[PDB]
Amino acid sequence: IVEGSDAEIGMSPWQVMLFRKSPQELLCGASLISDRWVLTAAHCLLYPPWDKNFTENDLLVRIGKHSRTRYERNIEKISMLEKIYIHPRYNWRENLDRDIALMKLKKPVAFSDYIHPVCLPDRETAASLLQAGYKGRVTGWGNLKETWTANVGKGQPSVLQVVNLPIVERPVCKDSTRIRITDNMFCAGYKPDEGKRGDACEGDSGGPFVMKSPFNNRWYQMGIVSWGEGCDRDGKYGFYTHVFRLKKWIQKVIDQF
Amino acid sequence: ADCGLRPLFEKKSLEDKTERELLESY
Amino acid sequence: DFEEIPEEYL
Ligand SMILES: *[C@@H]1O[C@H](CO)[C@@H](O)[C@H](O)[C@H]1NC(C)=O
**Among A227, A221, A198, A219, which residue's Cα sits nearest to residue A209?**
A221
| Domain boundaries, position B25 | 1-26
Q: How far apart are CA A7 and CA A28, in angstroms?
A: 17
Task: Determine which residue's CA is closest to atom 10 belonging to ligand 1.
Answer: A53
Q: How far is the CA of A31 from the centre of ligand 1 (A)?
A: 24
- CATH architecture assigned to A13-117+245-257: Beta Barrel (2.40)
Residue A5 annotated among the catalytic residues of the structure: no
* Fold classification of A1-12+118-244 (topology level): Thrombin, subunit H (2.40.10)
Q: How many residues does chain C have?
A: 10
**Of the partner residues A113, A135, A218, the one whose CB lies closest to the CB of residue B25:** A135
Number of domains into which chain B is organized: 1
Q: What are the phi and psi torsion angles at A50 (to 5°)?
A: -120, 15
Do A140 and A160 touch, CB atoms closer than 8 A? Answer: yes
* A24 touches C: beta carbon within 8 Å: yes
Q: B18–A166: do the CB atoms touch at under 8 Å?
A: no
Do A172 and A194 touch, CB atoms closer than 8 A? Answer: no
Closest-CA residue of B relative to A219 is B4
Residue ranges of domains in chain A: 1-12+118-244, 13-117+245-257
Q: Is A257 helix (H, G, I), strand (E, B) or coil?
A: coil
What CATH number is associated with residue B15?
A: 4.10.140.10
Q: What DSSP element (H or E) covers A36?
A: none
Q: What are the phi and psi torsion angles at B19 (to 5°)?
A: -45, -55
Do A132 and A169 touch, CB atoms closer than 8 A? Answer: yes
